[PDB]
Design an enzyme around this catalytic site. Structure first.
Site, PDB file in Angstrom:
ATOM      1  N   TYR A 174      37.942  40.467  30.493  1.00 47.62           N
ATOM      2  CA  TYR A 174      38.709  40.105  31.745  1.00 47.62           C
ATOM      3  C   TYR A 174      38.368  38.712  32.251  1.00 47.62           C
ATOM      4  O   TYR A 174      37.199  38.383  32.310  1.00 47.62           O
ATOM      5  CB  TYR A 174      38.442  41.207  32.765  1.00 47.62           C
ATOM      6  CG  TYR A 174      39.145  41.097  34.082  1.00 47.62           C
ATOM      7  CD1 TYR A 174      40.525  41.195  34.175  1.00 47.62           C
ATOM      8  CD2 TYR A 174      38.407  40.987  35.260  1.00 47.62           C
ATOM      9  CE1 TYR A 174      41.150  41.169  35.397  1.00 47.62           C
ATOM     10  CE2 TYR A 174      39.018  40.943  36.493  1.00 47.62           C
ATOM     11  CZ  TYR A 174      40.397  41.038  36.553  1.00 47.62           C
ATOM     12  OH  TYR A 174      41.011  40.976  37.761  1.00 47.62           O
TER      13      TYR A 174
ATOM     14  N   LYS B 236      46.103  48.297  39.887  1.00 48.70           N
ATOM     15  CA  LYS B 236      45.223  47.121  39.866  1.00 48.70           C
ATOM     16  C   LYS B 236      44.345  47.027  41.132  1.00 48.70           C
ATOM     17  O   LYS B 236      44.848  47.140  42.241  1.00 48.70           O
ATOM     18  CB  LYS B 236      46.058  45.888  39.782  1.00 48.70           C
ATOM     19  CG  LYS B 236      45.293  44.619  39.520  1.00 48.70           C
ATOM     20  CD  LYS B 236      44.849  44.508  38.066  1.00 48.70           C
ATOM     21  CE  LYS B 236      44.090  43.184  37.791  1.00 48.70           C
ATOM     22  NZ  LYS B 236      42.685  43.220  38.283  1.00 48.70           N
ATOM     23  N   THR B 237      43.056  46.750  40.929  1.00 49.97           N
ATOM     24  CA  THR B 237      42.110  46.433  41.983  1.00 49.97           C
ATOM     25  C   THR B 237      41.979  44.932  42.120  1.00 49.97           C
ATOM     26  O   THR B 237      42.210  44.193  41.167  1.00 49.97           O
ATOM     27  CB  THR B 237      40.708  46.932  41.588  1.00 49.97           C
ATOM     28  OG1 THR B 237      40.308  46.338  40.349  1.00 49.97           O
ATOM     29  CG2 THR B 237      40.717  48.382  41.420  1.00 49.97           C
ATOM     30  N   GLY B 238      41.601  44.476  43.306  1.00 48.47           N
ATOM     31  CA  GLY B 238      41.298  43.070  43.548  1.00 48.47           C
ATOM     32  C   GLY B 238      40.212  42.937  44.585  1.00 48.47           C
ATOM     33  O   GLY B 238      39.994  43.879  45.367  1.00 48.47           O
ATOM     34  N   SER B 239      39.517  41.782  44.553  1.00 49.36           N
ATOM     35  CA  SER B 239      38.406  41.453  45.409  1.00 49.36           C
ATOM     36  C   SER B 239      38.217  39.934  45.504  1.00 49.36           C
ATOM     37  O   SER B 239      38.274  39.268  44.483  1.00 49.36           O
ATOM     38  CB  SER B 239      37.144  42.045  44.817  1.00 49.36           C
ATOM     39  OG  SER B 239      37.046  43.411  45.010  1.00 49.36           O
TER      40      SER B 239
ATOM     41  N   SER C 217      42.183  39.603  42.867  1.00 46.03           N
ATOM     42  CA  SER C 217      42.844  39.732  41.593  1.00 46.03           C
ATOM     43  C   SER C 217      44.162  40.495  41.535  1.00 46.03           C
ATOM     44  O   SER C 217      44.798  40.434  40.541  1.00 46.03           O
ATOM     45  CB  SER C 217      41.891  40.313  40.563  1.00 46.03           C
ATOM     46  OG  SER C 217      40.890  39.341  40.407  1.00 46.03           O
TER      47      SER C 217
ATOM     48  N   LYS D  47      46.938  38.334  40.305  1.00 48.11           N
ATOM     49  CA  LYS D  47      47.338  38.359  38.875  1.00 48.11           C
ATOM     50  C   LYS D  47      48.688  39.004  38.637  1.00 48.11           C
ATOM     51  O   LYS D  47      49.410  38.598  37.735  1.00 48.11           O
ATOM     52  CB  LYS D  47      46.304  39.081  38.040  1.00 48.11           C
ATOM     53  CG  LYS D  47      44.989  38.297  37.963  1.00 48.11           C
ATOM     54  CD  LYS D  47      43.859  39.051  37.347  1.00 48.11           C
ATOM     55  CE  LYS D  47      42.781  38.038  37.014  1.00 48.11           C
ATOM     56  NZ  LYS D  47      41.820  37.778  38.116  1.00 48.11           N
TER      57      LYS D  47
ATOM     58  N   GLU E 105      47.416  47.368  34.916  1.00 46.33           N
ATOM     59  CA  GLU E 105      46.824  48.362  34.065  1.00 46.33           C
ATOM     60  C   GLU E 105      47.769  49.561  34.071  1.00 46.33           C
ATOM     61  O   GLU E 105      48.351  49.856  35.116  1.00 46.33           O
ATOM     62  CB  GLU E 105      45.388  48.702  34.545  1.00 46.33           C
ATOM     63  CG  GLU E 105      44.447  47.534  34.222  1.00 46.33           C
ATOM     64  CD  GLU E 105      43.119  47.500  35.034  1.00 46.33           C
ATOM     65  OE1 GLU E 105      42.715  48.582  35.511  1.00 46.33           O
ATOM     66  OE2 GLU E 105      42.513  46.365  35.212  1.00 46.33           O
TER      67      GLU E 105
HETATM   68  B1  LIG Z   1      39.585  39.928  40.555  1.00 42.29           B
HETATM   69  O1  LIG Z   1      39.441  40.211  42.051  1.00 42.29           O
HETATM   70  C1  LIG Z   1      38.553  38.771  40.099  1.00 42.29           C
HETATM   71  N1  LIG Z   1      37.398  38.811  40.953  1.00 42.29           N
HETATM   72  S1  LIG Z   1      36.105  37.849  40.805  1.00 42.29           S
HETATM   73  O2  LIG Z   1      34.989  38.726  40.657  1.00 42.29           O
HETATM   74  O3  LIG Z   1      36.206  36.899  39.718  1.00 42.29           O
HETATM   75  C2  LIG Z   1      36.029  36.976  42.138  1.00 42.29           C
HETATM   76  C3  LIG Z   1      35.242  37.371  43.223  1.00 42.29           C
HETATM   77  N2  LIG Z   1      35.177  36.579  44.311  1.00 42.29           N
HETATM   78  C4  LIG Z   1      35.847  35.408  44.407  1.00 42.29           C
HETATM   79  C5  LIG Z   1      35.705  34.641  45.667  1.00 42.29           C
HETATM   80  N3  LIG Z   1      35.335  35.010  46.915  1.00 42.29           N
HETATM   81  N4  LIG Z   1      35.429  33.841  47.692  1.00 42.29           N
HETATM   82  N5  LIG Z   1      35.833  32.770  46.898  1.00 42.29           N
HETATM   83  N6  LIG Z   1      35.999  33.345  45.629  1.00 42.29           N
HETATM   84  C6  LIG Z   1      36.662  34.974  43.360  1.00 42.29           C
HETATM   85  C7  LIG Z   1      36.736  35.777  42.214  1.00 42.29           C
HETATM   86  O4  LIG Z   1      39.425  41.144  39.759  1.00 42.29           O
HETATM   87  P1  LIG Z   1      38.425  42.341  40.237  1.00 42.29           P
HETATM   88  O5  LIG Z   1      39.100  43.350  41.119  1.00 42.29           O
HETATM   89  O6  LIG Z   1      37.324  41.514  40.901  1.00 42.29           O
HETATM   90  O7  LIG Z   1      38.028  43.145  39.012  1.00 42.29           O
END
Ligand SMILES: *[B@]([O])([C][N]S(=O)(=O)C1=[C]N=C(C2=NN=N[N]2)[C]=[C]1)OP([O])([O])=O
Length: 352
Positions: A144, A306-309, A58, A61, A266
């Site tokens: 979100y 900002k965090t992402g995952s 994320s 974004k 943020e």
């Molecule tokens: B973003 O990183 C949105 N993250 S999510 O939780 O919607 C997410 C998690 N994992 C995937 C993925 N892994 N492999 N294919 N897709 C997509 C989306 O904001 P955050 O930091 O998570 O708050």
């Protein structure tokens, strides 16, 4: 001392959460520091280095928000517009009563974190937005959401006449000086693309998904992310269009208590307490809808994060314009958002 601070605060997390590899970058007074730990690939024993490509999740974004800011300052869009003005096919459907700013900043009042699994095709996407129908008072509730900013992203690519992946790779990334940031990692770079590691330490990468590029689908290196942070700390040195885009992303739009929502970023009053930085990613803020109030205190001295995952990768990014510092952390295994935020807090606060 920068190196010694990151060793104290980020290094222990590799053992604690059995993380294969990590890259921590710090920028201060236009000097870049790059700290690399461990492996991009466990099976290959290939070390993390300056060419290592990580999934940003994320944090993608922020690029989608920068692309919108660019498009708005070239006159291609207005944030008061509705999505139907560009994607004709939604042009008096009820999604066309929500504006682009509300899409960007999650206040549609009825969009969740994910599409439904069933949606995948371009037709299934367009059909889910043809059949979209209201719920909470539009503009009043923050939840979100990947489809929401995802729609903003696609609408931005429609206003620029280029598919979204090309907007970033031919327009936005070059304007930012980014040499190895990609929506799609080409063939010559696959050797530098890290494996992510799930909670069973299995090597994995991100799965294809609907409007994945604008919501969570950018891949970058540590040098590149430090360049991106540089740009955010110094937009006056960049081309007019991108500079205006970056300033656009810094403007707080509303508060949700002590978090001000901007475009991707943020925003907080600085200095911020640690716990204020933690609550921005509390489940309440991230998963459950929340009612927004208008900015009351315009913060004087601001900071952004900002965090992402993705399921195999963790990212965190933070900058403070007035201290002229910032930090990026990238990992090829998810660690708790809380741990990312805290270490960064200690490193930046210790370097004044
Ligand atoms: B973003 O990183 C949105 N993250 S999510 O939780 O919607 C997410 C998690 N994992 C995937 C993925 N892994 N492999 N294919 N897709 C997509 C989306 O904001 P955050 O930091 O998570 O708050």
């Amino acid at each position: 001392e920068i190196k010694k601070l990151v060793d104290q605060n980020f290094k222990p997390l590799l053992e604690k959460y059995d993380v294969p590899g990590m890259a921590v970058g710090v920028i201060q007074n236009n000097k870049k520091y790059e700290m690399y730990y461990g492996l991009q690939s466990v099976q290959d024993k290939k070390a993390v280095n300056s060419n290592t490509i990580f999934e940003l999740g994320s944090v993608s974004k922020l690029f989608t928000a920068t692309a919108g800011g660019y498009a708005k300052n070239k006159g291609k869009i207005s944030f008061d517009d509705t999505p139907g003005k560009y994607w004709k096919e939604l042009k008096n459907t009820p999604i066309d009563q929500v504006n682009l700013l509300q899409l960007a900043t999650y206040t549609s009042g009825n969009l969740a974190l994910q599409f439904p699994d069933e949606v995948q095709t371009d037709q299934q996407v367009l059909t889910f937005f043809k059949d979209w129908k209201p719920k909470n008072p539009i503009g009043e509730y923050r939840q979100y959401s990947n489809p929401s900013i995802g729609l903003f992203g696609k609408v931005v690519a429609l206003s620029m006449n280029k598919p979204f992946d090309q907007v970033l790779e031919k327009t936005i990334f070059p304007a930012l000086g980014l040499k190895h940031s990609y929506v799609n990692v080409p063939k010559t770079q696959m050797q530098n693309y890290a494996f992510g590691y799930n909670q069973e330490n299995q090597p994995i990468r991100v799965n294809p998904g609907p409007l994945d590029a604008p919501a969570y689908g950018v891949k970058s290196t540590l040098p590149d992310m430090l360049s991106f942070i540089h740009a955010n700390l110094n937009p006056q040195k960049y081309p007019t269009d991108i500079q205006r885009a970056i300033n656009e992303t810094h403007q707080g739009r509303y508060q949700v208590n002590t978090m001000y929502q901007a475009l991707g970023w943020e925003e907080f009053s600085y200095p911020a307490t640690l716990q204020t930085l933690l609550d921005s990613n509390s489940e309440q803020i991230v998963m459950k809808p929340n009612k927004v109030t208008a900015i009351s205190k315009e913060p004087s001295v601001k900071m952004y994060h900002k965090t992402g995952s993705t399921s195999g990768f963790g990212t965190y990014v933070v900058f403070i314009p007035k201290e002229n510092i910032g930090l990026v952390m990238l990992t090829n295994k998810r660690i708790p958002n809380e741990e990312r935020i805290k270490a960064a807090y200690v490193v930046l606060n210790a370097i004044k």
